[model samples]
Target chain A: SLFELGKMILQETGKNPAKSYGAYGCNCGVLGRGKPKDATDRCCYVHKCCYKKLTGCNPKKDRYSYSWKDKTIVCGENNPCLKELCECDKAVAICLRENLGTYNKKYRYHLKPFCKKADDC
Target chain B: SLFELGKMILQETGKNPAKSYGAYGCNCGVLGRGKPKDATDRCCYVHKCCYKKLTGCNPKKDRYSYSWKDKTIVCGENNPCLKELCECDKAVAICLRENLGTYNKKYRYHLKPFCKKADDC
Candidate 1:
């Protein structure tokens, strides 16, 4: 699975290609809500915090900056990389901006963990 | 502190007044962000998940339902409690819908724990 590969990359490099480490995601959204039935499914870093910084993008210019409104870290509002990060990668950008993979991991974990071998995530 | 009292209430009742015990918060939002200086401040149940359910509100009708768009939980889109939860308690609902207390706990704990008795959260 690409996501599994992403995880392998995450574990091996500790390098979030999406760059959303320590970021957060909305569990209600497709990216985070693992089962469509379970609400708690979410991202690890993105579930609780913002990740653009870890992925090496400036928060203000990054595509996901709109998701950020009231913080002092200064990513999208008035930073230098705002335009580049925001415009560079739309899909991967949204993932980082909205903190998707983080919560997806949660849902993925939830599906199989308690299933008692019923279904594999 | 009201939050401590809230915690006590949570521990005792297992009843999330905000209806977001299992919900999440956007650590980036003002409601979730504890102190302006810190980036990770957030609500407990709201931090990484949606909280409207625990607090007894509908995410679809609740003011924060705009925050709930993708999932199939039937919150604000086509549900019964949608409008009521969306409008009734704007502040509290935002608190619950956004999951402020969770990440705020992290920042709160962050300030004090790493401070080594330097600052109290």
Candidate 2:
């Protein structure tokens, strides 16, 4: 009976029991801690929000890690989650063009972990 | 003129006399200094090498700066150069799919600059 109720809730919400949401332009890296530094970052903010609303998607898990891990599925995404991730990234790429021009080049990965265990849950 | 000769050379060789080249898996970030950490990184290595061969594209100029500035023209790149960047990235995505599974997530951006001028031309 409880399992059925849980399934009903899942069907109704169509979302995850997410522990956290994306931080501004930062999605899943050390970039997570910073404020939106550019207009393009706003694009990232939008992309994260898009991922947030999707049921199977986990934006935090599907991104680049300078430390040496990138969990994004590179194959043609057969599932809806990975498919939307591609769509969002494409939108962000378009947004990047709109915000193009002189840029600050200080963003480098320190080879550290962007998300910690406690940071996740 | 010298310009014509340069263009001819570019047309013939379709390459740049790169000051340096991609590390096994490192591309534009602090990651540039490392050896390939995984099979996926090798994909990155191939992507950078691909960029190196194009005449009009400056892979060094057109990438994630990790600095405040990212010079990649995020729009639909119409030029041959940017077009190849998109192709290469897409290929890399496909490659990522081929190398999926357990991962290490230690990589992160330090919010510092990955490429100094000396690291470039």
The prediction achieving the highest TM-score against the true structure is 2
- What is the lDDT, from 0 to 100, of the residue B61 in candidate 2? 32
Model 2 chain A: lowest-lDDT 10 consecutive positions: A15-24
Query: How well is each residue in A1-121 modelled by candidate 2, as lDDT tens digits?
Result: 1122122222332322111111222331212222345564455456545555566655434532111116221324567765665555545444544554422223212111221212121
Q: What is the docking quality class of candidate 2?
A: incorrect
Model 1 Cα lDDT, one tens digit per residue, B15-62: 563232321222222122222222222333232233334355433222
C-alpha lDDT (0 to 100) for residue B69 of candidate 1: 33
Docking class of 1: incorrect
True contacts kept of each: 0.00, 0.00
Count clashing residue pairs in model 2. Answer: 16
